[PDB]
Amino acid sequence: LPDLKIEKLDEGVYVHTSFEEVNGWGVVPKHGLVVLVNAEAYLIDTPFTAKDTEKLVTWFVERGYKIKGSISSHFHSDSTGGIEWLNSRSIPTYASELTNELLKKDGKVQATNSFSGVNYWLVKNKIEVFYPGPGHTPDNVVVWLPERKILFGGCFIKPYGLGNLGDANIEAWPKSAKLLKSKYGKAKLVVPSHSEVGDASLLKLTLEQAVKGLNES
Ligand SMILES: O=C(O)c1cccc(N2CCC(O)CC2)c1C(=O)O
Ligand SMILES: [Zn+2]
Ligand SMILES: [Zn+2]
């Protein structure tokens, strides 16, 4: 397995990339973010595992940053894998109410703090959370960074294929993807979980793939 990767994407914004072999998928890359505010750091999705979450946190703490919190974009373990270890270290963990419920049903440890509704501020005017409706999973949310115009789409952004449909709502995904295109068309950078960073076009491509996936069912 390739090592945890951490790259500067923009000023105060980093992409972390972790890797896990998944049956019927091979080695799966997973992108998340670290967002820097003053001398504080926010995890946008945890890596797959506690070890890599520890590795990631250590890298930033070692640079003089405090980890103020982590937000998980959906319940799957490529977003939540690290919640246990963070909780154990009293670092505040965030996820939607839906996400927390699905983690519970799945017999997984939940995030300490939750939220619900359409729009949520994790940090006022710096880190916004938006729930477009079901798609890749019932609970998938996106994270918007206003200053830099960066959107983390998580596993909802699927420009070339929908990927793992095990917990997908193919019926709702096109509608959800339309609402996401309307609101965030002004994004400079769009960060998918499982493919590379693109511009606002990735929103359109996601919509087409959702529509195409529905037609096929
Ligand atoms: O979103 C995907 O397309 C995807 C691809 C490969 C592995 C995945 N998961 C990794 C985490 C594991 O808990 C379930 C599958 C996913 C996903 O559904 O997020
Ligand atoms: Zn997923
Ligand atoms: Zn995923």
Residue 139: CATH number of its domain? 3.60.15.10
Token pair, residue 153, equals: 């789409």
125 is catalytic: no
Q: Which ligand is nearest to the CA of 25?
A: 1
Residue 31 counted as an annotated binding residue: yes
Q: Judge if the beta carbon of residue 194 lies within 6 A of ligand 1.
A: yes
β pairing state of 127-130 and 119-123? antiparallel
| Residue of 155, 156, 206 with the most ligand 1 atoms within 8 Å of its CB, for mutation | 155
CA gap 204, 185 in Å, rounded: 9
**Three-state secondary structure string covering the chain:** CCCCEEEEEECCEEEEEEEEEECCCEEEEEEEEEEEECCEEEEECCCCCHHHHHHHHHHHHCCCCEEEEEECCCCCHHHHCCHHHHHHCCCCEEEEHHHHHHHHHCCCCCCCEEECCCEEEEECCCEEEECCCCCCCCCCCEEEECCCCEEEEECCCCCCCCCCCCCCCCCCHHHHHHHHHHHHCCCCEEEECCCCCECCHHHHHHHHHHHHHHHHC
Phi and psi, residue 109, nearest 5°: -65, 135
30 is catalytic: no
Q: Judge if the beta carbon of residue 30 lies within 6 A of ligand 1.
A: no
Which residue range(s) make up the domain with 65? 1-217
Token pair, residue 210, equals: 């959702």
β pairing state of 93-96 and 40-44? unpaired
Domain count, the chain: 1
CA gap 180, 108 in Å, rounded: 28
CA gap 198, 27 in Å, rounded: 22
Residue 45 counted as an annotated binding residue: no
Q: Closest Cα to atom 10, ligand 1: which residue?
A: 78
186 is catalytic: no
Q: Judge if the beta carbon of residue 163 lies within 6 A of ligand 1.
A: yes
**Is-contact 131 156, C-beta < 8 A?**
no
Residue 16 counted as an annotated binding residue: no
